[PDB]
Design an enzyme around this catalytic site. Structure first.
Site, PDB file in Angstrom:
ATOM      1  N   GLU A 268      -3.820 -57.767   7.665  1.00 54.50           N
ATOM      2  CA  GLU A 268      -5.258 -57.605   7.899  1.00 54.50           C
ATOM      3  C   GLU A 268      -5.891 -56.293   7.416  1.00 54.50           C
ATOM      4  OE1 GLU A 268      -3.335 -59.403   9.885  1.00 54.50           O
ATOM      5  OE2 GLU A 268      -4.483 -61.267   9.731  1.00 54.50           O
TER       6      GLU A 268
ATOM      7  N   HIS B 269      -6.899 -65.497  21.540  1.00 58.21           N
ATOM      8  CA  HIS B 269      -7.501 -66.242  20.438  1.00 58.21           C
ATOM      9  C   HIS B 269      -8.896 -66.799  20.714  1.00 58.21           C
ATOM     10  CE1 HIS B 269      -3.368 -66.070  19.058  1.00 58.21           C
ATOM     11  NE2 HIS B 269      -3.694 -66.655  17.919  1.00 58.21           N
TER      12      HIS B 269
END
Ligand SMILES: Cc1ncc(C[n+]2csc(CCOP(=O)(O)OP(=O)(O)O)c2C)c(N)n1
Ligand SMILES: Cc1ncc(C[n+]2csc(CCOP(=O)(O)OP(=O)(O)O)c2C)c(N)n1
Ligand SMILES: [K+]
Ligand SMILES: [K+]
Ligand SMILES: [Mg+2]
Ligand SMILES: [Mg+2]
Lengths: 362, 330, 330, 362
Positions: free
Chosen positions: C60, C129
């Site tokens: 990321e 999430h």
């Protein structure tokens, strides 16, 4: 009278995953020597001036000086083309100059005046120039960016390379490793450069890194360790690394062993983690400007008198630039909201309370 | 009883908790031999050694995760970020590993850790080093966020932070570190604790309620002194805790003054002031309002370097006074 | 006619921008040969190749920074995060390297980049999430933040985002990807653009203004239909843009209805609803408000896994209708 | 009348910066063989049952199966003490079982019932147990955590070690490298384990990593490559790694070469990036359970009949657990806000709107 060129011996580089490294002998012309000497001298005097202005409180906040590391910015510039790209951290006064910005624009930005290269918006750490992307304050953040600039070089097929610099302290940032992997995976023309001045702020390399062989941290990426105090060694290693990248072989690591005479920043006397004797030893034994000077005088590439005259010209250039940076007015308050967004119609931005409105133009 | 700076009050708090519990330890960049980037941890290493005061490489995400892991295993770490601007690299560990763990495990895995360091604007540090994160952290459940102003707040809050068994973010202020305050004998004690979640009235007033946290609290007090000469009495409230904030004290004050003004140093949109105003409008104090609540904050731009620009990017006493006169219509 | 899903609309937008400008490219995890983690980039790699559609390893912070670099160098990267929960590891690159650069450089260095991916709650993905980041990103100056609901929104906003010369965060919603909507001929055009910064009234009303963004907008329309059968007409407003939000449109609506309810899927404190309520209070529509504004949001806890618990952690149509009746005292 | 134990030869491990590795021969007793067999069999049947429950919509969200990696979780457990520590990613149903949780508890948590190990608050990716710290959804995040747990082990001086697992996909995360540096710098008793099953979701290792030799990525940290399909190879290498860390020599990297029969998750068929024949070939020649079976029978450590008997009991056990998990009631709504904070007095937590209040108790 004066020799037009002279050959010198340069230290052999330590190699990692490289059959052969740069040559151990190089030629310096009189014309190049004079240019390099003047450049390093300008960087040196500009930093000593910044120091003076800082104590006088003309310059605020951060102000990291690079005196002692001049062989790095000038040697790097000497080994690449103006069309090549470079990005580094916050200790970039030298790079801003070698990349094309005048001493005036630089000092004016340090003193936060309208005439600064950023018009007093960024200060010491955030300066941009042609193909120079800062000037970045977050440690290690510039490495993935350099890989991104290198990606764009490949994407547009221009055959240019990108030099991405980071310090020894920053070499332990995780994003640097994600960058090594991607650069090697896509064979990006990225030259990863670790400026090793032996200290991460106040922490020495041995206390911060389990392994101090920075040129081999890339593992699968080839690397070389260079003498960062010798302008000629740096120039040779750079020409070698650049040619390596332009041939499509991918990324390469270069470790520059240098040293900073000042503390980490203006707020650090830099003596709680190292002795005054150590600093002076490096200065007397390997000051980069002294080394180039002795080489040119001995080889008769230049006279001690000519170099002295150059010093006088540089000192006057610095002084005249400082005069302009202290007399130049501050940016007008009316442009505080300027340049928040690019290519957008004008809009209003809120100030300290709802009754304070600032105009914002692109 | 004596004069002590915020820096020394925080140093005192950590020192006392280190002596009190062997499971407590400090870790961060330059925290040991360098005596701290802002000298807050001065003398600690020399007194406790390499095992308790740990210097770390420049790997935020790395040592933050290590601190959280050490907390899950029973230790009680104090993780120092040189500045919270740098906490963005390690924010995943704070939010996804520290904050939600006790809940996700159904009450089986607690995380007794403290994240501290300077937050917000300083002086001439520019855009990447002047951000306030009160609102960002205060937004996440399972986390406690405190923002001390003076020496008494600093010491009391850090000790409570250390004793709490959940993750606590302590947003300090670099400009406040060297400010001296009168330290009463009660604060000098090693048993001095300030509860998390309780505001404090720094100045009683009847005309208007002024709420703030961190450094600007001082500006509200100066503003109150000036307005006082004009016959206006401000009730200055020092939030102390961002999450869970003490809305009861704020509402009680509003029910008396009928006017409210919030002052913060961060960006206005989705900031601390917005939450206070919304809470006011949803609670029982809304009908006690005789005028709309107003917000004083920093300018909605990244922090400029130039002196005159920076001064107008941070709330000043004159901005506070101007907002108050607008609310009272005087 | 033509009915298209949100997923298909986004795919059309990107495909049209890729064809229009060869400097535009997509990068992210599994976007190429895998056809997309959620199939949004299906067929793109097959048509454009390894140079324009790049699969990246799981790094990321790395590829986000690589993306910003490419944008600074003149390219127009579309950086995809599998979910925005994973953008926390690279949020520093988004805020400190992309958002603030144009300002700090004095207007010399623009950063034309887009960050997109599903945001907020899904179905049974648990605490790590399900976080909504609208409030976090919308808080930062120098950035533009959009949150599309239906197909029209998705296509128009992604195209405007790509053409904008500043960093734009596009918060999509996984549950909306497979939802089909009627796609008018206009939206079918390769020239279809939705201006960033303007809200859209999805339903005309006179009794109350209901503002929302993303998935819950569908819930508001659902609540409005149920309420109309009772004689209550809601004016539903789809924000579309989080920063800079279209407060002007919201105010014009309140000045007609005199009532306001905000609806969002994220956490309540320091959330989107708080900013709207603070703006209304400081604005010209405050005197037109006959009842305080109320906020409908997700529960103030990390997302639980069990079905029944998750159902009560997200705003349901019943919660919206309840809030609306309370505001109208009916 | 079976042999009480037998000696077996195992493949030698590849070594990185290690003078010597684990032994090439090991002794397996009957009591252990029978035990490991039942364990791997239980994990295998539990995953196949989870798969079935998922298709029936009894399990929601994520559900990553470790089907085919049984020799790893059982082998690792066989090489460590219950007082040692372990932390892994989201594909850890097997690890939760080998760490002491019952199949009933595991399946009930997957079906989101109050009988789950987390009362139905965490799901498939978040399950904890004694010295088992999950069960982590953010790729790579568990490595620094593991290093922190190792730090605590060193700090407490009880000679405990910590095993930290991450997949080959996670191997390219930056924080893992920050963790390597600090673990080596401080000689933390941390065993970094890379479960290399050839695929990072849909991306093969060759497309995601410039270097596919994971046991060496640690660079300055020693490592070894192990056959992750042979339970006896894993046990022996694990026992070696643990002894290395307990002796105070610092961290060590262990790469387990394994394979996953199912797709990345339930929503991934796992056949668009690899062929069905490849999956079948590995299963046919290196299934962990068959390998142990053929080893015990051939060495007269056990009879094929006895192993068949174990399979029947295991199937029975899994069937009862599945019945329990499908019939166990959901958790009560009144406890939605429980356990937000530890050791705090109760308090109110806001629901969808201000009129919805949930109680929160530690
Ligand atoms: C992510 C991050 N963490 C911490 C800091 C604070 N900081 C600024 S400079 C510095 C030292 C970096 O040392 P080095 O990379 O060796 O470079 P040098 O100053 O010696 O050139 C640190 C820790 C930062 N800027 N960014
Ligand atoms: C920081 C982060 N980025 C991306 C993801 C999405 N994601 C979940 S699993 C996964 C694959 C990881 O592969 P690997 O590490 O090899 O482990 P495996 O599932 O094969 O055991 C990815 C990319 C994530 N959860 N966290
Ligand atoms: K704590
Ligand atoms: K853009
Ligand atoms: Mg250094
Ligand atoms: Mg894998």
């Amino acid at each position: 009278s004066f020799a037009n060129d002279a050959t010198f011996e340069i230290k052999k580089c330590d190699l990692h995953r490289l059959e052969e490294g740069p040559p151990v002998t190089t030629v310096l012309t009189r014309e190049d020597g004079l240019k390099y000497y003047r450049m390093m001298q300008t960087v040196r005097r500009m930093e000593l001036k910044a120091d003076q202005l800082y104590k006088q409180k003309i310059i605020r906040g951060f102000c990291h000086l690079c005196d002692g590391q001049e062989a790095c910015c000038v040697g790097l510039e000497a080994g690449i083309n103006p069309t090549d790209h470079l990005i580094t951290a916050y200790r970039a006064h030298g790079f801003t100059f070698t990349r094309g910005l005048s001493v005036r624009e630089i000092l004016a930005e340090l003193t936060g005046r309208k005439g600064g290269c950023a018009k007093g918006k960024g200060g010491s750490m955030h300066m941009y120039a042609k193909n120079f992307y800062g000037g970045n304050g977050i440690v290690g953040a510039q490495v993935p960016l350099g890989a991104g600039i290198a990606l764009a070089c490949k994407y547009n097929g221009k055959d240019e390379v990108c030099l991405t610099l980071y310090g020894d302290g920053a070499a332990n940032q995780g994003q640097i490793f994600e960058a090594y992997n991607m650069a090697a995976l896509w064979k990006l023309p990225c030259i990863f450069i670790c400026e090793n001045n032996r200290y991460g702020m106040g922490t020495s390399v041995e206390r911060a890194a389990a392994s101090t062989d920075y040129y081999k941290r890339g593992d699968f990426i080839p690397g070389l360790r260079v003498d960062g105090m010798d302008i000629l060694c740096v120039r040779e290693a750079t020409r070698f690394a650049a040619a390596y990248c332009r041939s499509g072989k991918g990324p390469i690591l270069m470790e520059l062993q240098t040293y900073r005479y000042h503390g980490h920043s203006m707020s650090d006397p830099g003596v709680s983690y190292r002795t005054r004797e150590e600093i002076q030893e490096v200065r007397s034994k390997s000051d980069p400007i002294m080394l180039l000077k002795d080489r040119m005088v001995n080889s008769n590439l230049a006279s001690v008198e000519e170099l002295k005259e150059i010093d006088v010209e540089v000192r006057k250039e610095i002084e005249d630039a400082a005069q302009f940076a202290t007399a130049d007015p501050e940016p007008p308050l009316e442009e505080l909201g300027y340049h928040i967004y690019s290519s957008d119609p004008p809009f209003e931005v809120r100030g300290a309370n709802q009754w304070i409105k600032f105009k914002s133009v692109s | 009883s004596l004069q002590v700076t915020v820096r020394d009050a925080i140093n005192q708090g950590m020192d006392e908790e280190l002596e009190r519990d062997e499971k407590v330890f400090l870790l961060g960049e330059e925290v040991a031999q360098y005596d701290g980037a802002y000298k807050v941890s001065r003398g600690l290493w020399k007194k406790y050694g390499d095992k308790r005061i740990i210097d770390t490489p420049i790997s935020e995400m790395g040592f933050a995760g290590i601190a959280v892991g050490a907390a899950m295993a029973g230790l009680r770490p104090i993780c120092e970020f040189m500045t919270f601007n740098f906490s963005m690299q390690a924010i995943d560990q704070v939010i996804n590993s520290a904050a939600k763990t006790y809940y996700m495990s159904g009450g089986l895995q607690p995380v007794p850790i403290v994240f501290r360091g300077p937050n917000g604007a300083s002086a001439g540090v520019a855009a990447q080093h002047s951000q306030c994160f009160a609102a960002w952290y205060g937004h996440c459940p399972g986390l406690k966020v405190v923002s001390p102003w003076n020496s008494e707040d600093a010491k009391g809050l850090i000790k409570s932070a250390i004793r709490d068994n959940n993750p606590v973010v302590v947003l300090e202020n670099e400009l406040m570190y060297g400010v001296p305050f009168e330290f009463p004998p009660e604060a000098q004690s090693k048993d001095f604790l300030i509860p998390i979640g309780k505001a404090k009235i720094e100045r009683q007033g009847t005309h208007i309620t002024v709420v703030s946290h961190s450094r600007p609290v001082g500006h509200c007090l100066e503003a109150a002194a000036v307005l006082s000469k004009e016959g206006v009495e401000c009730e200055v409230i020092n939030m102390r805790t961002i999450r869970p904030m003490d809305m009861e004290t704020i509402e009680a004050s509003v029910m008396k003054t009928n006017h409210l003004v919030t002052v913060e140093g961060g960006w206005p949109q989705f900031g601390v002031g917005a939450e206070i105003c919304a809470r006011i409008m949803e609670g029982p104090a809304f009908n006690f309002l005789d005028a709309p609540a107003v917000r004083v904050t920093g300018a909605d731009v990244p922090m400029p370097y130039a002196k005159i620009l920076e001064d107008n990017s941070i709330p000043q006493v004159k901005d506070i006074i101007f907002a108050i006169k607008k609310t009272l219509n005087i």
